[PDB]
Amino acid sequence: VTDPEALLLLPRLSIQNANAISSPLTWGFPSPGAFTGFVHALQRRVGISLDIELDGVGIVCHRFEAQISQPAGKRTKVFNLTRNPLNRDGSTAAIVEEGRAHLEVSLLLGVHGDGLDDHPAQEIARQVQEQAGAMRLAGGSILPWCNERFPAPNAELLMLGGSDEQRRKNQRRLTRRLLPGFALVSREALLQQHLETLRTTLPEATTLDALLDLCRINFEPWQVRDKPGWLVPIPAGYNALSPLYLPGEVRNARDRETPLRFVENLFGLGEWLSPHRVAALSDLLWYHHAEPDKGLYRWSTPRFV
Template structure:
């Protein structure tokens, strides 16, 4: 397993209003764009800036301040779908379900590159240049919109990281204030593994998918309670249904974290109709894990917030990782 690349700078782009982002993150999950959408955004932004700025986007963090899923219904919700034009013969065209969501998010990018060596007084101009480029791009399929009337868009911040760990944590403590109020998405692979061990104590045949499904829903179990009879008779037994998902677990959510190989790695150009005929090709499927939404004020280091790519061609795993759980073990 790889670790977070060594980063020397941070770029904070606060309060981005994104309209009609993709709310369907995988075949099994919906409600927020997949984290791969944001790591892909970082790569696309790096390519757009390649001719003007020497910056490498090594990692990205996401903080959600507000969301509005484009759905209707109470208990059973359905997406608001667009009406497609009729066919040539006048019949109704097929509807392809598209989930959309409006977002108010802040993005934090972990950077390396020669551009970070610029004088401190030039960093605000470089931050605005990167932010202006980002405002013209799609974020998870959605469009970046201007601020609401009467409000100003907060200025982006580009900063270099101090080599001293204590100073770096203090700088991040000041930076995270701009991320409040909101919730940051972090990885909780550890909760999935621990719940799998708990599940196998009563169900030896359970696998990781069973544990993932069990954590993705709210389970209710019956509990019998005995109450003494004031008259001295037999105690009365009452049945009470209790939720098995405790509040101490936090705001956990099922989420896709990348892709796993379904086929060997084929040479470039050997698979017909591939999008890129100059890159090796492989069929993949989604990988799933557990995430948690935490308030930024509970984060103590930037590594707890950032997601980075972990590509293992030999094992066929292409996934995004986050070191939140690993840093919790170190602090404990």
């Protein structure tokens, strides 16, 4: 839950065949919990032998299309699909719709390990980069190394140790390789004080992000209101309403040595920011925590400003 000993960037993590919808109320860029699970699985298959520890992620989202189409010029969109194989009766399958996108990202992390304490620097960085491209991240395989490998080997950029002015120039030595994207950070305090400031009509809580992906205007009794960025809802955690269970209590879990809880979605909003407009790059990580006293199994960006 701490700023790292050292950062670790992976400049063109070109991925492919991702999941677009990721939640029942949006379809764009996938959930940040997919990336936190990605780095937990990377920590599981790397840092138990190389002794590091990964907590937060950094999204930059270079380019993002989606297999979507416009039906007959309506004010809506549709999805492109994939052909399911043949049913046992052999007429057609029960066709089911899901969004599948092909995005671009670069992930910076947070390390509590010995990458330059008892192991050398680019050996650890190169083995982690070479081993990262063998696993999926959002239901989609990473597009492997190609002509994009030519800027892909990286440093292992320290933060916690160095000169202060060179702390500045190391984090903006990391910013120089990160220009054409737009980073994702949460707006938790903006959620709080923007629902509480605008409580002059009703106190409802789920109507906040349900009333921001639209052009709000109280026009002239032509002046479009001051948009503060890119107001867009995100899946911001998991409320587990029903209590805990057991592997023998509810059968058909994945492993029978880990407990089961039925869960529901939660919607905060996440602004999109250029990386220049931050406090520091250690101030944008999507961490993880679980509060089993509550139902809140919620990830977060602590200290986004």
